[PDB]
Amino acid sequence: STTEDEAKKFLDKFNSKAEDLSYESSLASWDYNTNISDENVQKMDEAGAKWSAFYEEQSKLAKNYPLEEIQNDTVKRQLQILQQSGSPVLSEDKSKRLNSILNAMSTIYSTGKVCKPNNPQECLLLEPGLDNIMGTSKDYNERLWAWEGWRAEVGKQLRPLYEEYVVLKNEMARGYHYEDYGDYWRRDYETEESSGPGYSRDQLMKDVDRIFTEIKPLYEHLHAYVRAKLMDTYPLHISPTGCLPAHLLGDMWGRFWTNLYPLTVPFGQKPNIDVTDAMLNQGWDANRIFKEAEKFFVSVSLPKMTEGFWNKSMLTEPGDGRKVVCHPTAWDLGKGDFRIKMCTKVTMEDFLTAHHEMGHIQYDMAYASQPYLLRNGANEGFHEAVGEVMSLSVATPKHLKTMGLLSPDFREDDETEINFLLKQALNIVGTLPFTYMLEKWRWMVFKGEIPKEEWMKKWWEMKREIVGVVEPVPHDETYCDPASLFHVANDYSFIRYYTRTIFEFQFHEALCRIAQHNGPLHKCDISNSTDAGKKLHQMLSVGKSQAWTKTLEDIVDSRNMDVGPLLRYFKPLYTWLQEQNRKSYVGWNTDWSPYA
Ligand SMILES: *[C@@H]1O[C@H](CO)[C@@H](O[C@@H]2O[C@H](CO)[C@@H](O)[C@H](O)[C@H]2NC(C)=O)[C@H](O)[C@H]1NC(C)=O
Ligand SMILES: *[C@@H]1O[C@H](CO)[C@@H](O)[C@H](O)[C@H]1NC(C)=O
Ligand SMILES: *[C@@H]1O[C@H](CO)[C@@H](O)[C@H](O)[C@H]1NC(C)=O
Ligand SMILES: *[C@@H]1O[C@H](CO)[C@@H](O)[C@H](O)[C@H]1NC(C)=O
Ligand SMILES: [Zn+2]
């Protein structure tokens, strides 16, 4: 017979085995995460080792299958995603060296701490001490000391480890017939199967550069406004026409500017919308929050939650008989099992995180009939986008008013609108240049255009160009500041947090185009709409069987990355910032430095 039927039978056998194998592995990981002990860790390790061995064996048996002679799309994409394991391309010495380097970097990041001067015993860890310090303290010297200590503790020790890591990664990428590790990361967006506009790994960088250049005006206005607002609390630490200090962005690295909201609030006289008070007054619990989320989701013609999700997930902290580290995760155990692990409290942030997790669960249930290799999003930016569009549609005051959470006598004037827009921009807009510059620096380091003896010499250059922030103290070639982030020194991609921002606002407005919404975009509501829900479900059910460009154009009528919806959403805040910056300089000076 032909190779097509042989590959089909091989994939059928592989799926029939991997279903049960991944089911057992997911059960083990869930028993570990929900019951921390010493034997559960061993069981999870055995399950993971078995799953990895099976995956490697299937990759070896699939490598001998030619993709050129095969004409079908599903089997071709399945063999393509199966052949990309990563581990079995090198010898044992380099593999063990890379594994030891990864484990050492993870241990250094987990046990990293900063010791205050003149106190060798009072050393504070990163979480939750350093995070709280960088997010709540409004002092210059304290934040500067914390940043310098974290840098000198993490990068100074991870520099040679990161050097060997990037060397081994580039060598493995060259072994996998790839250009560099940046190519191995960008291979996720490459869909060489659509007849016509086929997306390539080189077009992704160009599209990201174009969308960054298009965001540049709004981000520059926002940065100028934040600088003008922070100039009141920092009279001699921030120049009006220069860059901003890196240790004053709300956290240790500057990924989110939300912590700067009390200092950059447009109108401090009006309080923000708070729901936890009405929830505590009306006697709300986790079950009520989840039932309200299920009702909101089924009002958009989406399926409801199954009884297994209700009697198997961990919606509340059990306590008194177990110890767990609970972070919001929408887990898919396979075979039609979907659970949510989260210690949801009676608040508003947890109220939105519940809707986020329910959207993630709905997205996972959308492709429940797709093959195991296609039981995921088309790219790494659709999951979080689908999770965030629901939170955007829920956080509107209309949903809180017509459902019994906010008083009907709440006047919605432009002050609260500007406040909400600025609060959203401090979290969504302030991360795009940071993510872009981090991914570009990592790609250029993988490609070899930045020699080691100049790595940092470039890291602080783009910081002044792309983001517009200047370092507080000069760093020589012994620091490895970029590795101070969790996602950087963990073999984790970072562009997934960028494209989602484009993929989120594109979807929302699109739904608002079907629900016949009129007026501003920040007052949209997808609830009580069957037409938009049908298109949403049809877009979510495709999973990974089709190219991401086709899935995008089947939802927003555009087969390319477009940041237009983001500008249309932030147009009110854009005009407000343009009117406010009439007495301030827009832009930053690349040559200015705080230490002169
Ligand atoms: C979706 O529509 C339904 C019905 O049109 C809304 O439900 C009503 O809420 C009012 C009070 O605001 C009650 O008096 C009605 O009895 C409710 N009807 C039903 C059938 O329950 C619902 O609030 C709408 N949802 C949103 C988010 O606007
Ligand atoms: C959790 O683990 C402990 C010991 O590891 C065991 O005694 C207990 O029954 C487990 N709980 C559940 C719900 O399985
Ligand atoms: C590809 O295979 C799937 C199932 O393996 C089948 O449903 C589909 O029709 C095939 N496509 C073509 C073009 O043969
Ligand atoms: C949920 O599962 C438990 C067993 O863990 C069972 O005792 C209980 O009856 C179940 N509840 C429902 C509503 O099925
Ligand atoms: Zn999520």
Numbering used by the authors: 19 to 614
How is this structure described in the published paper?
The cryoelectron microscopy (cryo-EM) structure of bACE2-Rm, which was expressed in HEK293T cells, was also determined, which showed no substantial difference with bACE2-Rm from the SARS-CoV-2 RBD/bACE2-Rm complex crystal structure. The results showed that the SARS-CoV-2 RBD could bind to bACE2-Rm–expressing HEK293T cells with a substantially lower positive rate than that of hACE2, with 34.5% bACE2-Rm–expressing cells that stained positive versus 91.6% hACE2-expressing cells that stained positive. bACE2-Rm contains six potential N-linked glycosylation sites (N53, N90, N329, N546, N660, and N690), and the structure of hACE2 has been revealed to be highly glycosylated. Overall, the structure of the bACE2-Rm extracellular domain is composed of an N-terminal peptidase domain (PD) and a C-terminal collectrin-like domain (CLD), which is similar to hACE2. Superimposition of the PD of bACE2-Rm and hACE2 yields a root mean square deviation (RMSD) of 0.711 Å for 559 equivalent Cα atoms, indicating the highly conserved conformation of bACE2-Rm. The structure of bACE2-Rm is highly conserved with that of hACE2, providing the structural basis for cross-species interaction of CoVs originating from bats.
Among the SARS-CoV-2 proteins, the spike (S) protein, which consists of an N-terminal S1 subunit and a C-terminal S2 subunit, is critical for the recognition of host cell receptors and serves as the key determinant of host specificity for CoVs. The C-terminal domain of the S1 subunit, also known as the receptor binding domain (RBD), binds to the human angiotensin-converting enzyme 2 (hACE2), the receptor for SARS-CoV and the human coronavirus NL-63 (5–9). Bats are considered as the reservoir host animals of SARS-CoV-2, and several SARS-CoV-2-related CoVs have been identified from bats. Here, we report that SARS-CoV-2 receptor binding domain (RBD) binds to bACE2-Rm with lower affinity than that to human ACE2 receptor (hACE2).
